[PDB]
Amino acid sequence: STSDLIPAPPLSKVPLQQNFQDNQFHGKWYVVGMAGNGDLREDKDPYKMRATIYELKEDKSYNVTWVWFLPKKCKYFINTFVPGSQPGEFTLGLIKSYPGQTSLLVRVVSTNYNQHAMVFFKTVIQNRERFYITLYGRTKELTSELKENFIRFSKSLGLPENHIVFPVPIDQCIDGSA
Numbered sequence: 001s002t003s004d005l006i007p008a009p010p011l012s013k014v015p016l017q018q019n020f021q022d023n024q025f026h027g028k029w030y031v032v033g034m035a036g037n038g039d040l041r042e043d044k045d046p047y048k049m050r051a052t053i054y055e056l057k058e059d060k061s062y063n064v065t066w067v068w069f070l071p072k073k074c075k076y077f078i079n080t081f082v083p084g085s086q087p088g089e090f091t092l093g094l095i096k097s098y099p100g101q102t103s104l105l106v107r108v109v110s111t112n113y114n115q116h117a118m119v120f121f122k123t124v125i126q127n128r129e130r131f132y133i134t135l136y137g138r139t140k141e142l143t144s145e146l147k148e149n150f151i152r153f154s155k156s157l158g159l160p161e162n163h164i165v166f167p168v169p170i171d172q173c174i175d176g177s178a
């Protein structure tokens with residue numbers, strides 16, 4: 001009897017990592033966990049994304065490279081994060097590799113820079129809000145405790161168990177010389 005989208009939370013339910021350090025968040029992060037407000041039987045493209053490179057520029061924006069894994073190829077996207085109202089928050093810049101749309105809000109919820117990062121993303125598609133939570137590692141694995149913490153936060157925003165997945169780590173696309 002499903003719904004197509006879990007309603008977007010009030011941004012008062014999405015905290016920001018205190019004392020955000022832009023230079024310490026720079027570099028490569030691997031996807032350990034991903035959750036979203038779409039039915040995973042329909043919403044397939046976001047779950048192809050298995051790594052991100054965040055390159056801090058002199059102007060305090062990030063040049064952001066997204067790596068997708070497909071069974072017989074890699075795909076890559078580049079877009080620009082402009083610093084928002086508060087350290088750890090960002091909006092979309094107009095430099096990007098795809099013509100499609102203009103709207104992204106980003107909030108870094110928790111990070112210790114050398115181990116884990118948990119990031120909230122919200123976009124508007126066809127007049128309605130889509131939202132995702134990514135759990136990143138500096139390596140391809142994290143502890144039981146940190147993965148359990150991400151499940152608890154995902155559930156606090158109204159996502160059920162079957163909207164939360166931990167992909168099998170891979171070698172294709174996300175290594176290389178990147």
Ligand SMILES: O=C(O)CCCCCN1C(=O)[C@@H]2[C@H](C1=O)[C@]1(Cl)C(Cl)=C(Cl)[C@@]2(Cl)C1(Cl)Cl
Nearest residue numbers: 045046047049066077079098100104121132
């Ligand atoms: O081609 C288009 O219109 C959109 C292609 C996606 C732009 C690049 N990009 C992104 O901007 C991000 C991640 C990403 O890959 C991912 Cl998984 C997707 Cl899809 C989007 Cl949109 C987000 Cl916000 C998320 Cl984290 Cl959900």
